[PDB]
Structure 1
Amino acid sequence: MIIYRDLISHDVMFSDIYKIREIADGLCLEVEGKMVSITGVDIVMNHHLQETSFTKEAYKKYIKDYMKSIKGKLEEQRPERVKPFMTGAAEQIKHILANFKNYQFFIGENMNPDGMVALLDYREDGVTPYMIFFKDGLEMEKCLEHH
């Protein structure tokens, strides 16, 4: 199976046992979760994601830093992704800041402040949870029977 982990913090963000949608012209991965009850969201609960908070200004400071960290990672391993990421993320930041009050913030288990901040949101029904990750900020891992 496929486990996805934060390219910076190395924590597991989510696995392939969820409905994954690639949105924003391949910039982001939209993971659909279920509300489960202690109450919460399954993605958060079984991958031990930690909730964190941001002012509008702190998030701007943080995401500039995060963008340049990913930019440096991509130049080394996936150079073709630098421009798409830099353009897309800049446009995605504008969207996130536009509906800032709609999001909750989650980071990996180790709580590395330089790692990815996943965004929690609810569908049109206002009941279904889904989480947004930057695809370029994730590295894939594959697990198989071993003897």
Structure 2
Amino acid sequence: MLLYKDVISGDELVSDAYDLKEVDDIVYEADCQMVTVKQGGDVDIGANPSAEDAEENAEEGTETVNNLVYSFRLSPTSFDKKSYMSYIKGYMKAIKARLQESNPERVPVFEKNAIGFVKKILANFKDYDFYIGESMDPDAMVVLMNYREDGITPYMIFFKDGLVSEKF
């Protein structure tokens, strides 16, 4: 029920309606489940000439999708290996300033903890993928999608430093 949004440019990055766990480091984890819904194509809010919506006569088009991405229309975008270093570097520094203006005591704990997680993320930045909200900003809240140690549990992480809690 809790709603967490970013102030830099995340806009509703995740919520507790699913489940959130903060790792000893400084990030939250919102688990997502798969649900089957009847979708008949969308392609943005308008962008098609003429169609029939028939395809076959033995299946309409049921597609399972995460409940967090569907409710928050999460939008995953492609990225570059070297481009990732520039986004995490200029983004980490951006937060460093937000602490100095708000809480300067979070500058050191945030640097050491965030530095450790970044080192374990580069080991497989591809397996963590890179998501982005409708804001379309490579310097806003960045969420990564990774499967637990099992693989049957899809979960994403949201930097707690750039995540606030909102009560209904």
2:68 is equivalent to residue 43 of structure 1: yes
Residue 110 of structure 1, aligned match among 129, 132, 135 = 135
Quickly say closer, same or farther: Cα 1:44–1:7, change in 2 above 3 A.
Answer: same
Between structure 1 and structure 2, the one with the greater Rg is 2
Q: Which residue of 2 aligns with 1:137?
A: 162
In 1, Cα distance between the equivalents of 2:112 and 2:70? 32
Q: When the two structures are aligned, how many residues end up with a matched partner?
A: 142
**Which stretches of structure 1, 4 residues or longer, exceed 4 Å deviation after superposition?**
none
Contact residue 4 and residue 141 of structure 1 kept, 8 A: yes
Q: CA deviation at 1:111?
A: 1.4
- Read off the aligned partner of 1:132 and give its amino acid letter: I
Match of 1:122 in 2: 147
Give yes or no for the alignment of 1:17 onto 2:17. yes
**1:66 CA drift (Å):** 0.6
Q: 2: CA distance between counterparts of 1:94 and 1:26?
A: 13
Task: Indicate the SS of the match to 2:126.
Answer: helix
Which structure has more strand as a fraction of its residues? 1
> What's the CA shift string for 1:10-39, capped at 9, x where partnerless?
51011221211110x241111111123333
User: Percent identity, aligned pairs only?
Assistant: 52
**Structure 1: 5+ residue stretches without partners:** none
CA distance in 2, matches of 1:106, 1:122: 14
Q: Does the Cα contact within 8 Å between 2:29 and 2:155 map onto a contact in 1?
A: yes
TM-score, normalization: structure 1? 0.88
CA contact 2:25–2:114 (8 Å) conserved in 1? no
More helix by share: 1
Contact 2:14 2:158 in 1 (8 A): no
Distance, in Å, in 1 between the alignment partners of 2:73 and 2:2 is 17
Deviation of 1:95 after TM superposition, in Å, equals: 0.5
2:5–2:164 contact (8 Å) kept in structure 1: yes
CA RMSD in angstroms comes to 1.5
> Which letter maps to 1:139?
V
Give me the TM-score of the superposition, normalised by structure 2: 0.78
Do residues 59 (structure 1) and 58 (structure 2) align?
no
Q: Aligned ranges for residues 59-98 of structure 1 at < 5 Å? A: 59-98=84-123
TM-fit CA distance, 1:120: 0.3
Query: Displacement of 1:141 after TM fit?
Result: 1.8
Q: Is the 8 A contact 1:4 1:13 kept in 2?
A: yes
